[PDB]
Amino acid sequence: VNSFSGYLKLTDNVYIKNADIVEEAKKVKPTVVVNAANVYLKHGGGVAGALNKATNNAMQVESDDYIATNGPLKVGGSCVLSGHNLAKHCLHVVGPNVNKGEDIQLLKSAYENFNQHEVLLAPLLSAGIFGADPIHSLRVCVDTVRTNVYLAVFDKNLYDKLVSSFL
């Protein structure tokens, strides 16, 4: 039993809710919140900008030190950093950004990072300002992630479409 509330169950291990991931993280304090990161960990907008704003920019400060030491992530890759006031840990995962021309096949590699964590609160990777079809992202999630994932979808209209079209 865990504290996630109000989710629709899609499969054995994937759950979905119309929610603001920032507000959901603030209430649940999950072990892991996933950030929709880029390779530079520049948290300017979308989910990343919102998560970073909620940490009062502490996420960005920590991320800049990470990059200065380690260099950029790979598209499809991830790193574990602090969850600050939102979660124990933040798993920064880089899905391909279609608006930069990155290969959508890398979306499966991106979701594979979730399998290193037993339970996660997450957005749909490569959705929103990353330009991919969220219906496709949900399909890849379900077919790739084997651990327990709680997906927060900010847009109510999109949430209803994802549910109604789910196979």
Ligand X SMILES: Cc1ccc([C@@H]2C[C@@H](C)CCN2C(=O)c2ncnc3[nH]ccc23)o1
- How many angstroms separate the CA atoms of 117 and 20, rounded? 21
Mark residues 102-131: x for contact with ligand X by CB under 6 A, - for none: ---------------------xx--xx---
CB of 68 to ligand X, least distance (A): 27
Residues 48/64, Cβ–Cβ less than 8 Å: no
Among 25, 106, 120, 153, binds ligand X (CB under 6 A): 153
User: Of 6-14, 43-51, 79-87, 100-108, which part binds ligand X (CB under 6 A)?
Assistant: 43-51
- Per the DSSP assignment, residues forming a β-bridge with 90 are 33, 81
- Residue 94 contacts ligand X per CB under 6 A: no
Breaks after residues in the chain, judged by C–N over 2.5 Å? none
Amino acid at 88: K
List 134, 140, 142, 149, residue binding ligand X (CB under 6 A): 134
**C-alpha 47, offset from chain centre:** 8
Q: Is 16 in the site for ligand X (CB under 6 A)?
A: no
**How far apart are the C-alpha atoms of 20 and 144, rounded to whole Å?**
24
d(CA 35, CA 29): 14
Question: Is 98 an interacting residue with respect to ligand X (CB under 6 A)?
Answer: no
152 sits near ligand X (criterion: CB under 6 A): yes
Site size with ligand X, rule: CB under 6 A: 16
Please give the residue ranges that form the binding site for ligand X (CB under 6 A): 20-22, 46-47, 50, 123-124, 127-128, 134, 152-155, 158
